[PDB]
């Protein structure tokens, strides 16, 4: 596999010539994402970016192509990888490689190397070359970062280094492990420094979603975290409006190009009631659908039980559900003998960041029959039993795998929340140690109050005398810091 | 055009290597309708339509699909077309035609003439295709209709006959009936008794929708009905389920997929409240949408106000609106003065059942431009502001156009209506005058009860004693005839 | 018991020095009832009611004082009671003794037989009263009704004039009605022709509720419905409003009040999904409780589901429901052995029209203790299972028995109704057999139009092109005859 | 004003003779407060408030009354008044100076000095009278506070013993302020060390709400807190859960007893949407209302914004709102002129903690004319206008003014975590410095379970996988401390 390389510009991507519809769908998406073009004009002409060389590795759809593009109008160099097989918008990617003023014969973007539908080892090779820089004395130095693959990749791949060997797999790792051990592997017979190099070079990682998160947080306490870091899931502006208002949003778009179930009626079983499990149990609720939650956290099990939801276990409820959906982030939700329970036609999906909240594996292993019928939806067959389940996106974020993810003006929050991290950790890079920070209250408000505005919404101004009262300025920060919304 | 001719069959659909991912859809689809399940054991045997020849002119889904094949398993012949140009699901109609066991090379399925994306002519050609049956001593004995355009192809069509001559079309009739009228005049050049003679055959007609059924009271309000009619729309376990929950589900599919904007948030305007609309604002609502509605019926528009709605006219509402739905089944909702208004980049779109809710007409001899962006998907771009609207299927019926229209579980309470309806004519026909009739209550009950239990839900029964207070049967019906449900 | 007297009006009501609070809460009242108000105006030089004797039987609330004073507006004596034994607001029943413009000691008003509280004995006595004009051989020409005791009354008392015999009850009879039959009784040593003259100058009935209506359509089918009657229930702007709506608002109310018990989180069964049904399980909905509902319709059964609740019988459901309620018309729903099975310190009520939804009489003879909490809250202990229930009203319609019935601006559409069909059999007695009927639907609009207007909604014109398209008048119907709205 | 004393327990109240009825109440309420019995039987054996002598300031209610018995079960001593001139329940008031063993001639309960309708020198001669201890050998060692009135009280009092003077105060000042300043200066007078003394003893204050806590932040910051405090508020268990679901409770209660208005198609304006704000809109919403709010926060407007509400501005909106509703926990929110600037009949109510987030101050110095409706509801006419409003409460708390506050479920969990505050603050003194505290995680938990098992809710258990993958214990706490549920 090797990059394709045209004007300068490698990148490895399905369709170039997707490139002027992709332009056309980025240009809508503009308008739905102020927050992205209120930076690029408050930015434009400070280029608070130059010298950034940003490996992304993110979902490459058209909300994220704002972004890049976000990213180079503030002065960034950047190379991109998506962080999932089948999250790739297509169109999107080409419009990348082509930049707004680019042809597919004359491309003007930048390098992308990403399709919907790549495999385990074309999934590795890519999130490879989008942090494998041209010039070997300028490496990354950036790391926007989606679920941590790049992170890991670089940590775990100098890890590896310093110890002078890269470890075999066990028979039964994940595949995903199998494949990432064999990268790393392979280009340590031919290149013994390369990720330690980079990771001397990264001045900071910008981090995006919970799983990618809790092992930042898990890094850091390892002593293991290189560069300064970033939380980005944490701003109220991300988890509060995109875990939660966008998956109200994508969770219904997923399963209805999937499988045109009506939900309506139907007994629907939702694991987890963290911001994610909250957007697809109001969204399946909205719906018509019946609506139980599953929760190991009494807090927010009684949080969906004052929302109207029965709190039950997978246990007790799985035969009865006409479609599942796991909303953890955690393994092992939904086992093999889970599915062998699960009634005739019944669907399956995971909207978590990883596959293995579905015993994918086990129900590969398991002697079941697999029909395709259609992209990212799979017939199960089960010859004891004779039922058949539907499992969406091979268990994979099934929002992103079967429909478009989140939203345009809900990504706007989320891509805001790490344009300014990425400006902030990198004209500040000597005011962070390598440890994992929020951003401060007041740049949330700024997200926030741009979404306001372009909705229309009208804002109160506090008296002076208002202000002192709640001893706060009239300008913000408004709450205090433990504050939750 | 020409029709293609595989092994005794006529038809013309996209593209006949399709079948197979129908064929699936199609097996998916059987298990979501327990209605025409149900009506498939419970008559195979009796074979109650051995003898019909029925002509149907309804949108060419999975759904549809199924239909089709609980007629021919219940004894009938069918030839099919859509009754929309953009509505056609090309995989369902290549099934069809092949049928369950048929092949691409060998079909052993039935006429359909449709695909998605025709033009105007093309589309009355397909029609005409329908009801012209080979063998004229065998024309259409029965019509399945939705919208009403097979019944008016054999009434007008008819009442040109009579008059010896086909009129011409006015300086500016609707492209539509300009084309309607061209089929009739170049076939009444060859052909002077042929809607005469197919009007002389038909023995009822069934009509699935309520803007059919308006016209059908029209056709009979003037003397002009030639059959007895069945409104299968009056069903209370049609309108009250398909119309509007049916519309809850596919509203929003149709738009996430033509769009994939944000609704939570959004300023949103239905027209209409009925039970189309009121599916629209049930559905905006529950995605955290801003919903206000139009009507002119106050008893709709208190209904509205008590579900937490804004009743507002076009002309207070449509400069502010995010999102515009036209759901009445009217003429003149959003003229082109109010598209002028429209806000930058607001979504512009039509759920009833033609395309002049929407000034269409109006919007293209204006002199604003339009870009398309992909099938079924326009900006128009007014160069005076410089304020764009995205148009949704060219102002026609939304969710069929942009998505798939209902799910098969909701088509699964329209289509046992139709099913049962369409015996019931084929076999007491004698039963029946010229003129539109709605189904026993019963019967509505006998369908409704097929799907709670499908869905798990447990009806309670009646002990006798309380039959008896009630003054109705233990096996109903259980509600006087005026009831509203 | 003897009736009062003062400046000519005949009375029997709690206490008079009420008036005060009763006159300022009928003028706030006053102005959320524009559709009463309207009809005071439009109605004023008129006097439509001028020689009508009108003897109303409907819960003396302080919307039913309103609806009193419209009636008299018009030019109408009238005699009112209670429908129900706790309903009576004492306040309203002393303002219309009293009147607009009169003292305790010297009342304006109009006479009035009602307090909360009544013995069954009290209750049919005061009904007896109501019904008892003191002028010659001019007695009562109109009742306007709600549940049918005034009609039942009246038609059953001269049904055993008649006869000669009144009949000794049988010892499985309720209270109520061995209470009944033993006024009959007294009064047929007394009077011979009492009840035969009164059915004789009784013009017509108006009747307000369901489980009236249903009662009036069983008298009509024996031949022996003495005179014309209007089903107002089943006006548009009453069931799907009142029903629906004030229930929403009122079921809450009264739970609130009676126990203060926290609903969201709750599991709650609401037995029955007519219009009162759909009414309570949306408030329960709303306040976060985990609805599930019973019914015996399948229709009814596939909205409750749609609408994202189980539907379930009583058996399966009542040991787990911390709150049920019935809501049905019928008897024998909740059995004293549902109630043993229920769990401890559960609520019960009922909402539709008389106290034998529940098995009160089974519970009364059980052997569980009753302990009273406060007027209409008793909690109900078994002690062999040791569990308690808290009961409310005794099983009567808890909204007006815990609270205050449906709010002014609901009760608005209902007394609307009320009045326009007063004016009706009035005005238009010779076209009215001895049959049931139904307003018209200009009506009914009519209704429904001045509040919309007056919530400040804005209904859209048809032009004239919109309404021929339609086949409707742009002031005239908007729906057929069978439309479900 | 003299407290009366009945077996050598002083109090004041106003009617000993609701005990009777009081009791029931509470042992009702105990069946639905399982936090509180939970740790009744946990606790009553360790006895861990053994010498604790609890002065609260709290309001009255049921619910505090189970609380005030939970402190007595556990070893405290505790002297009560109502933090509110309004919320008082005078019958559980009555319920607690008995005892569950008492009678009215034989009362066994705790000081009480509070009744329903205060006037505000009795408001503060109760809590006088509450922080006042006979022995003064033994004062007040600890405050379970409630908006902070008994903590001013003690620290305000003793900055003015220090100070040698207590100010005066102007014409122009907070009514209940120069109040403040006339016990304070009267007392100083005779005593002029005594709340000195009793700053002194004070181990610690437990603070309930959201006002109360502002105001501890204002003492903290100026190193004035005299003691190691801490904020209950903000738990999860209570600000997530009583502040949103309390209130979505107790909001349309109040309104319910003190107006009876239609909620349905209403516009109502919420000003604020912080959690009260929140729960206010969601009861408003699921009653069928059309909300708009009011913020000054982008993030919480935001979050309005994509719940289905129009963000507006008081000034905008206020002419045209039929309920108004403050929720903001700031002064001057609604002034004259917007009250002045209200449509005639509409309603105005305050659910936040102090009065004067509405203007009552210059509404009563307006010249507008007041009736009293009964008792919590005043009709304001204006003259000029000819307009009358309805002012809940005279603007206090409504929901515990107009009705009877938060339900007993719901209190159960701001309860249990007062309750181990209390059990902290006092067996383990030592570890706290004179700061504001919150509880940790791990208790929160505890609190959630105990009511997610009363609900019938069953958790899931992390195998230690999961436990292992997550980063934490099976045992919990499950969330990172930031963590915003
Ligand atoms: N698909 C998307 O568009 C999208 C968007 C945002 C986040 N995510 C991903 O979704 C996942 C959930 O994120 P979140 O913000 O909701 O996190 P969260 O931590 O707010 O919520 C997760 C919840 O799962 C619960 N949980 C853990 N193990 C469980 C088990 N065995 N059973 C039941 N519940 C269990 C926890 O108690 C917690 O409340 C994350 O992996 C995140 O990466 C996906
Ligand atoms: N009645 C009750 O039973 C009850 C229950 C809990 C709390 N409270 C009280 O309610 C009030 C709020 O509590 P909370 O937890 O919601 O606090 P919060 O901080 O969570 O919410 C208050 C919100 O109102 C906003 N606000 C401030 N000034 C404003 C203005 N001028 N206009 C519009 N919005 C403004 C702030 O942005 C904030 O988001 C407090 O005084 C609290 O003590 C009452
Ligand atoms: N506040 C109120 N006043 C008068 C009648 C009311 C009421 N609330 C409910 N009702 C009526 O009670 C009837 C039950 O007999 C219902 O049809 C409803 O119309």
């Known amino acids: 596999l090797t990059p394709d390389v045209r004007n300068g510009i490698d990148f490895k991507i399905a369709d170039l010539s997707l490139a002027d519809f992709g332009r056309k769908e980025l240009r809508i998406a503009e308008h739905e994402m102020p927050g992205l073009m209120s930076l690029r004009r408050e930015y434009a002409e400070v280029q608070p970016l130059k010298g950034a060389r940003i490996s992304g590795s993110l979902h490459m759809t058209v909300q994220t192509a704002v972004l890049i593009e976000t990213l180079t109008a503030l002065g960034a160099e950047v190379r991109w990888a998506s962080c999932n097989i089948f999250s790739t918008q297509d169109h999107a990617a080409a419009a990348v490689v082509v930049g707004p003023h680019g042809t597919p014969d004359e491309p003007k973007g930048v390098p992308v190397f ?38 890991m990749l670089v940590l775990r791949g100098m890890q590896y280094e310093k110890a002078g060997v890269v470890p075999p797999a066990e028979e039964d790792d994940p595949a995903e492990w199998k ?12 290149d013994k420094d390369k990720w330690t190099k980079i990771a001397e070079s990264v001045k900071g990682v910008t981090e995006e979603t919970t799983t990618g998160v809790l092992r930042l947080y898990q890094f850091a306490a390892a002593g293991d975290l290189a560069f300064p870091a970033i939380n980005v899931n944490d701003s109220v ?15 219904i778009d997923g399963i209805n190009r999937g499988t045109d179930a009506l939900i309506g009626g139907k ?22 659908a019946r609506v139980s939650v599953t929760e190991i956290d009494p807090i927010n099990a009684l949080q969906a039980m004052m929302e109207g939801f029965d709190v039950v276990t997978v246990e007790e409820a ?22 062998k329970a699960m009634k005739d036609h019944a669907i399956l999906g995971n909207i978590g960041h990883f596959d293995n909240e579905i015993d994918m594996a086990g129900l590969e292993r398991s002697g079941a029959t697999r029909v395709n019928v259609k992209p990212q939806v799979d017939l199960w067959t089960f010859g004891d039993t004779g039922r058949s389940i539907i499992v969406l996106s091979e268990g994979r974020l ?13 990504m706007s929050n989320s891509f805001a929340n790490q344009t300014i991290a990425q400006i902030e950790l990198w004209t500040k890079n000597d005011e962070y140690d390598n440890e994992v920070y929020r951003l401060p209250k007041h740049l949330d408000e700024k997200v926030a109050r741009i979404h306001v505005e372009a909705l229309g919404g009208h804002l ?12 706060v300025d009239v300008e913000g ?3 205090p810091d433990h504050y939750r919304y």
């Open 114 to 151: 990403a399709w919907k539908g790549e495999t385990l080892e074309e999934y590795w090779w890519a999130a490879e070359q989008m942090l494998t820089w041209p010039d070997p004395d300028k490496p990354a130095n950036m790391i926007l970062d989606d679920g941590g693959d790049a992170t």
């Open 179 to 190: 494949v990432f051990l064999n990268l790393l592997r392979t280009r340590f017979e031919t």
């Open 237 to 251: 502006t991300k988890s509060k409006f995109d875990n939660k208002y966008g998956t109200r949003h994508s969770l």
């Open 267 to 288: 007994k629907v079983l939702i694991c987890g009631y963290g911001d994610v499990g909250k957007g697809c149990a109001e969204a399946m609720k909205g719906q018509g």
């Open 318 to 339: 799985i035969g009865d559900a006409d479609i599942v959906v796991t909303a953890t982030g955690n393994k092992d939700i939904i086992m093999l003998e889970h599915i």
């Open 398 to 410: 099934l929002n992103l795998g079967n429909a478009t993810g989140h939203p345009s003006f809900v």
């Open 460 to 471: 109160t101004k506090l008296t002076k005398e208002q202000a002192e009262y709640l001893g």
């Open 477 to 479: 920060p408004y709450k």
